[PDB]
Amino acid sequence: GLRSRAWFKLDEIQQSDKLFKPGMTVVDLGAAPGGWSQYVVTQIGGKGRIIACDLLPMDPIVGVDFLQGDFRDELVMKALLERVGDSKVQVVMSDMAPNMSGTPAVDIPRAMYLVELALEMCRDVLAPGGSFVVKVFQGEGFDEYLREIRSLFTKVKVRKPDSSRARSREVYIVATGRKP
Ligand SMILES: C[S@@+](CC[C@H](N)C(=O)[O-])C[C@H]1O[C@@H](n2cnc3c(N)ncnc32)[C@H](O)[C@@H]1O
């Protein structure tokens, strides 16, 4: 197809939640191969920009400052913050997912650690009034994580994009209005 399933999932979320506007600065976590950043550039336009990160390398995209590295490493976090600089960040988007073993009691904790790191980054860099979109899996830790997100944002919705495989346990938490 012309675009990836991931690109279509974000397009569906943009349609339901209107997260991306012209000129915004966006952080893209777990960006490879680049569908979400590709999609967001069409919305924020040439004057907006994205600071992206993934363990894997990916094709460059004009307007996207991409840093290959392990988001769990504080050194990588520091380098991402050097790319954000004093730019106000209006949206943090995370599609990070760990390598899956196939065993829930192992995969869920692995995944939950990554989304907790994404939320912590929201606390530090997401501007007041900003948004967060994050891939989360159903099951252990979901309730507590949604609660943590609801305490940091004004409105929170749980989305299951039509393009998201009904067989997959993923959902996308879409939070808006980051609190002061
Ligand atoms: C679902 S794919 C992302 C697809 C992306 N949204 C797109 O549109 O192309 C998830 C990605 O998360 C990344 N990931 C997982 N753990 C990570 C970590 N510790 N640091 C950075 N990226 C990580 C992977 O390497 C994998 O590329």
Swiss-Prot record:
EC assignment: 2.1.1.166
Q: Which GO CC annotations does the UniProt entry carry?
A: cytoplasm
The answer to whether keyword S-adenosyl-L-methionine applies is: yes
Function according to Swiss-Prot or TrEMBL: Specifically methylates the uridine in position 2552 of 23S rRNA at the 2'-O position of the ribose in the fully assembled 50S ribosomal subunit.
Keywords, in A-Z order: Cytoplasm, Methyltransferase, rRNA processing, S-adenosyl-L-methionine, Transferase
What is the name of the protein in this document? Ribosomal RNA large subunit methyltransferase E
- One Pfam match, given by its short name, reads FtsJ
- Which SUPFAM superfamilies does the UniProt record give? S-adenosyl-L-methionine-dependent methyltransferases (SSF53335)
Identify the HAMAP family for this entry: RNA_methyltr_E (MF_01547)
**What InterPro entries does the record tag this protein with?**
RNA_methyltr_RlmE, RNA_MeTrfase_FtsJ_dom, rRNA-MeTfrase_E, rRNA_MeTrfase_gammaproteobac, SAM-dependent_MTases_sf
Alphabetically, the GO molecular function entries are:
rRNA (uridine-2'-O-)-methyltransferase activity
Q: Which NCBIfam families match?
A: PRK11188.1, rrmJ
Q: What is its subcellular localisation?
A: Cytoplasm
Name the coiled-coil region(s): none
Which reactions does this protein catalyse? Answer: uridine(2552) in 23S rRNA + S-adenosyl-L-methionine = 2'-O-methyluridine(2552) in 23S rRNA + S-adenosyl-L-homocysteine + H(+)
Please name the gene that encodes this protein: rlmE
Q: Which organism is it from?
A: Escherichia coli O6:H1 (strain CFT073 / ATCC 700928 / UPEC)
Coarse class of the primary localization is cytoplasm
Which family is annotated?
Belongs to the class I-like SAM-binding methyltransferase superfamily. RNA methyltransferase RlmE family.
Q: Where is the active site?
A: K135
The record lists S-adenosyl-L-methionine as bound by G34, W36, D54, D70, D95
The answer to whether UniProt assigns keyword Methyltransferase to this entry is yes
